[PDB]
Design a protein around this nucleic acid. Sequence first.
DNA 1: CGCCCGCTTCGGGGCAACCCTGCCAGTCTAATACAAATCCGGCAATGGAGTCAAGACCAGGTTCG
Length: 49
Amino acid sequence: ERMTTQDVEAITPQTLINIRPVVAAIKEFFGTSQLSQFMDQNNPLSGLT
DNA sequence: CGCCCGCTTCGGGGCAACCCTGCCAGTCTAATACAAATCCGGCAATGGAGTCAAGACCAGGTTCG
């Protein structure tokens, strides 16, 4: 999107790349997903299992 | 000639147990300019509401003649 609206001979990948949707996807995977489960450690066997 | 209807299939809504147990989800042209409304801060009319000091006032329980 901003590869066009930005003026040429002025921009740089510091001004192009937005890391905020990237970091949000990782944080919404490790938080609040039904595979990012809470570590069930009431003994070493269930910790392993 | 074009005209219409009986089975077939395609789709579409409804339902599929019950106790506990858990707890808070997203993104960009950017500012001026002005006016009505609102609000809040400070004296300034209070007079009402409370507070004290003083006393007058009884009429009854306590003591002397």
